[PDB]
Structure 1
């Protein structure tokens, strides 16, 4: 192990950002080695007095050192520090205790080939791609380096969340390329693309039964998310994906948040908030919950049965908020069955406690589908 190159070491995390570092270092003396993207030097990061401390690993005459002996590799330096229990510096008194290994989700850049751009997200372009080992087709999310540091820190949230999930109606994470820049999130490629484009393109040919089965899929995904305490926050047709067999998967988990007691209090400072898909209490008071996702699901039902019409077309975001406060809601689409529209109206109850559960939504859509 100690003879293996640095890049192969389990405790070498490469281009991991500072915020993820604090996530991974749990106990006193927990440590990892990474590359400082800014400075272009190796860094030893160690938890001490509850906070991560960062030490620049010095290099001279092909020997690596801190303030003591030099070694011809960083793994030899780390082995020395761990085995001797010598403080990293006399001044700091920091002592290594446990190497934090990479999780199973870390993917080497060499394992991936990027293809054509397929979309544009809030953080940057999304590309198609392939895993070199087996020709698995993938979708690859990128993060533009010019984004504000506070927003870039949030990029890996989608991956942290999806690491935990497995469901037929939720997009599958494949890995995260954090060993070098540029940082990527790698997911299964859902080849039929987004649901909004699907509806608009294939509209005329779609049977009501098929539409009900697809939103039924969306409801199952959301039921699963609710069971995991996940609040999605960005549910919309454009953020659902369609497989070759017309199965719908929920996608785009960048804004999603896990909350054990079911409520996420927003910072208030979110840019490009999907106002027309968002519940009043979430906009007014920053109160996001499964109940605010239910509101969004109502809008998704509307998009589905209008075959991809744009909601509140004649209104600005602010006018839409004012309209909704007055009791304004979207009209019944002509292809929408009466029963679907009654469910839709319940999803848009002004008070969050009055909206249906995702279980109820799933079961109601299923019952309607068995008529058609």
Structure 2
């Protein structure tokens, strides 16, 4: 009962891990060990509806079918014991939005991030999105809060880690990440992830600000459907802002695909005038 890349899978295909092999270590979702493999353990509340149950199963099926370095791996599940577990790659850096906020330059850490760090995050997630696009999977909620980092320090890799919106489709709408045609007609295509990536790019280069500062969801909806776009984040290089504004083309067919976005990110990455730009320091 779940189809991805033209292949079907069901609960039977999930890799069940004996509960006795699984130890919880600490809350982070928990850090856990499988018998020694470090994992994150996502739990289903025992007090939940059968729809929560089906939601949890679908989440497991979706993440287990992906195979890509910028999408969080599923080690397995433990569904035959209660509470039910999904076992996931442990991402010690935590979520991207929190990371940017915590790790932005300050006097105590004046060079905590550089432009190249942000470009590598952008590349990482764009590579994940390209894999989803080429496999015809529409994510529908590409946003910093949904991405995870392998570790806090140098060599960190960013990955897409949450697929709940796609799971649900398979006041809570992520309006600020959605293109005009998703509001109006409720039409989604891979061009809709392109728009959302544009907004994630603004999040990254703003070092974790909420998009459309000062605007509520409905004000954003009217702004965007009237042609309004966000200004550049502070100190954002022109070439990077231009990737964003191309992602935010009104017509879906005018937005770049992720192969092109990756090309432009790689280009920014080799340009000394981009990567030698200092990030703002937060006081």
Q: Which runs of 5+ in 2 are unaligned?
A: 3-7, 106-111, 276-283
> Take 1:153 and 1:189, find their aligned partners in 2: how far apart are those partners?
24
Residue number in structure 2 paired with 1:183: 84
Note if 1:336 corresponds to 2:236.
Answer: yes
CA deviations on 1:127-177 (whole Å, 9 max, x unpaired) are 22111x12x111122233555544542222222122222211110001111
Shift in Å, 1:351: 1.7
- Contact 1:234/1:274 (8 A) holds in 2: yes
- Contact 1:196/1:308 (8 A) holds in 2: yes
Residue number in structure 1 paired with 2:139: 232
Q: Which runs of 5+ in 1 are unaligned?
A: 1-18, 21-25, 27-99, 119-125, 258-263
Note if 1:171 corresponds to 2:72.
Answer: yes
- Contact 2:90/2:150 (8 A) holds in 1: no
Which of 111, 118, 121 is the equivalent residue of 1:211? 118
When the two structures are superposed, what TM-score results if normalisation uses the length of structure 1? 0.64
Residue number in structure 1 paired with 2:174: 274
Residue number in structure 2 paired with 1:89: none
Shift in Å, 1:207: 1.0
Residue number in structure 2 paired with 1:158: 59
Larger C-alpha radius of gyration, 1 or 2? 1
Which of 294, 299, 308 is the equivalent residue of 2:208? 308
Residue number in structure 2 paired with 1:249: 159
Partner of 1:115: helix, strand, or coil?
A: strand
Which of 339, 348, 364 is the equivalent residue of 2:264? 364
Map 1:28-47; keep pairs closer than 5 Å: none
Shift in Å, 1:343: 1.1
Counterparts in 2 of 1:162 and 1:203: CA distance versus 1, 3 Å: same
Counterparts in 2 of 1:278 and 1:151: CA distance versus 1, 3 Å: farther
Residue number in structure 2 paired with 1:111: 21
Note if 1:220 corresponds to 2:127.
Answer: yes
Aligned length: 257
> Take 1:152 and 1:278, find their aligned partners in 2: how far apart are those partners?
28
Counterparts in 2 of 1:149 and 1:313: CA distance versus 1, 3 Å: farther
Structure scoring higher RCO (CA < 8 A, sep ≥ 6) equals 2
> Take 1:114 and 1:272, find their aligned partners in 2: how far apart are those partners?
31
- Contact 2:176/2:211 (8 A) holds in 1: yes
Note if 1:298 corresponds to 2:208.
Answer: no
Shift in Å, 1:364: 0.5
Q: Tell me which protein shows more strand as a share of its residues.
A: 1
Residue number in structure 2 paired with 1:144: 45
* Aligned alpha-carbon RMSD (Å): 2.4
Residue number in structure 2 paired with 1:129: 32
Partner of 2:13: helix, strand, or coil?
A: coil
